[PDB]
UniProtKB/Swiss-Prot annotation:
Top-level division of the source organism's lineage: Eukaryota
Protein localization: Nucleus; Chromosome
Disease / disorder: Cornelia de Lange syndrome 6: A form of Cornelia de Lange syndrome, a clinically heterogeneous developmental disorder associated with malformations affecting multiple systems. It is characterized by facial dysmorphisms, abnormal hands and feet, growth delay, cognitive retardation, hirsutism, gastroesophageal dysfunction and cardiac, ophthalmologic and genitourinary anomalies. CDLS6 inheritance is autosomal dominant.
Name the record gives this protein: Bromodomain-containing protein 4
Gene name of this polypeptide: BRD4
Subunit structure: Interacts with p53/TP53; the interaction is direct. Interacts (via CTD region) with CDK9 and CCNT1, acting as an associated component of P-TEFb complex. Interacts with RELA (when acetylated at 'Lys-310'). Interacts (via NET domain) with NSD3, CHD4, BICRA and ATAD5. The interaction with BICRA bridges BRD4 to the GBAF complex. Interacts (via NET domain) with JMJD6 (via JmjC and N-terminal domains); the interaction is stronger in presence of ssRNA and recruits JMJD6 on distal enhancers. Interacts with NSD3. Interacts with NIPBL.
Note, other: JQ1, a thieno-triazolo-1,4-diazepine derivative, and I-BET, a benzodiazepine derivative, have been tested on tumors with success. Treatment with GSK1210151A (I-BET151, a I-BET derivative) has strong effets on mixed lineage leukemia and promotes myeloid differentiation and leukemia stem-cell depletion.
Organism: Homo sapiens (Human)
Positions of the Bromo domain: 17-123
This protein's domain notes: The NET domain mediates interaction with a number of chromatin proteins involved in transcription regulation (NSD3, JMJD6, CHD4, GLTSCR1 and ATAD5).
Family: Belongs to the BET family.
Covalent link location (Glycyl lysine isopeptide (Lys-Gly) (interchain with G-Cter in SUMO2)): 58
Positions marked as site (Acetylated histone binding): 99
Length: 127
């Protein structure tokens, strides 16, 4: 029932980096997913109390959401782009585990996941 604390977006002891790939993930990949018509449920941690989903955090043990990912990109929380990509893949996998196929939320996540994959199919490089 209770909402756990949301995932950290800053850690003074974690080594940070900004790469061109990470800057792209923020400016292009995240901000394009953000504006999609299906993005709104994924823009903040799932509020199990508001939604009356006391089982949500009983089943989902590594929560993740694009709002968290956004703040992590903006705080250069990540070391490389694959760390970020893994937060996206965790967010989608969470949705498919907790829900069932055909659910409206699942249809939303599948659409987002395909757009996301289009956008990271080609990332930039550094010289
Ligand atoms: C990942 C995620 C996000 C949400 C969700 C989040 C918010 C925003 S907040 C501040 O209240 O948490 C509102 N409604 C939601 O549920 C929906 C339920 C039907 C639907 F068609 C569209 C939804 F967005 N849910 C709900 C159930 N399962 C999930 O995996 C899930």
């Amino acid at each position: 029932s209770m909402n756990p604390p949301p995932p950290e977006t800053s850690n003074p002891n974690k080594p940070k980096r900004q790469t061109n790939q990470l800057q792209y993930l923020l400016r292009v990949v995240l901000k394009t997913l953000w504006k999609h018509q299906f993005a709104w449920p994924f823009q903040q941690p799932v509020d199990a109390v508001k939604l009356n989903l006391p089982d949500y955090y009983k089943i989902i043990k590594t929560p993740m959401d694009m709002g968290t990912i956004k703040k992590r990109l903006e705080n250069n929380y990540y070391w490389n782009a694959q760390e970020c990509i893994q937060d996206f893949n965790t967010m989608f996998t969470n949705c498919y585990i907790y829900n069932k196929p055909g659910d409206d939320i699942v249809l939303m996540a599948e659409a987002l996941e395909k757009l996301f994959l289009q956008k990271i199919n080609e990332l930039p490089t550094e010289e």
